[PDB]
Amino acid sequence: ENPLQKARILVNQLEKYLDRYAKEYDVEHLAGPQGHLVMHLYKHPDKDMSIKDAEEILHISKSVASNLVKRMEKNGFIAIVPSKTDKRVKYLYLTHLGKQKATQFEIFLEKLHSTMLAGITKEEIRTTKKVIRTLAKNMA
Amino acid sequence: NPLQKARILVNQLEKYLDRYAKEYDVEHLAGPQGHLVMHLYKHPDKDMSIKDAEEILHISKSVASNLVKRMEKNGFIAIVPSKTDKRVKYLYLTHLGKQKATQFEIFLEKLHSTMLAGITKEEIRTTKKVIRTLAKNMA
DNA sequence: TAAAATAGTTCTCACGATAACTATTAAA
DNA sequence: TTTAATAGTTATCGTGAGAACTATTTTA
């Protein structure tokens, strides 16, 4: 068999269903990094998150973080506000729609594990995760 | 929550493979370009159209169309209209294509061996049906 | 103060998705 | 032969990457 190809395919379909599922459940656009950042802002309302902080949370690059915050703004999930102390920093803030969505989305996450990890065991699962961990760790 | 982490671990995986391949003179082929070059090599007696690539790689119509444009630009393939069916365009490995399939097949071997080191088979075979289940679950 | 770390943007790109469109062949 | 299906392209988009570029702190 082949390991590079299969993996890529399996993710492409998985990614594609999550998009389908999430539109029907009224969390369109959040199956992905947008949803992950909305969740992070929710869980931690006390911390200032700047754009750079998003790079590190989501494990993405400069340009990717910049373009991602732009998309979230266009979608109404966030407001971007320059800092007054550090003139180069821009802060991110969940909007009202943002806050409402963080909630609908947390439900959706629950309904996912409940549906996609059916027929699988936590040992089976814990081992695949070590299968994965070591794959990872193989690239120093 | 953890399902996110999944797509992260792909982003690194995808990222390293691109570094590895360029270092090893198979640039641009860690990915669908490489997978299609292989398919053409392994089967030189089957004529393959752009649509056939949609099916081999499980991609959409436009993804396939754009992908072949990228391979042509890279030198790995030539695109030739069918003379029987004026709708169809056939794909053909170029000379550079053919040699790359070779260096790439080597790359695959090396990568596989260096990635599944310290891992058993049942562990790996169970990872499969754990993954096949997920896929099956999203049906 | 001069030089370097930092925060963000914009360029060009690879690789995925739809949807709307042109052709062309096949089917009814 | 009117209609369906098929093959490919191009539009807009989401989500990844690096590189070159501002503009602001640091810090040496």
Residue numbers in the entry:
A (entry chain B): 2 to 141
B (entry chain A): 3 to 141
What does the report in the manuscript say about this coordinate set?
In the present study, we conducted structural and functional analyses of the heme-responsive sensor protein PefR (porphyrin-regulated efflux regulator) from the β-hemolytic bacterium Streptococcus agalactiae, which is the most common cause of life-threatening invasive bacterial infections (e.g., septicemia, pneumonia, and meningitis) during the neonatal period. Therefore, PefR promotes the expression of these heme efflux systems in S. agalactiae in response to the intracellular heme concentration, likely by binding heme. The monomer consists of six α-helices and two β-strands containing a winged helix-turn-helix (wHTH) motif. This architecture of PefR is similar to that of the multiple antibiotic resistance regulator (MarR) family of transcriptional regulators, in which helices α2–α4 and strands β1–β2 form the DNA-binding domains.
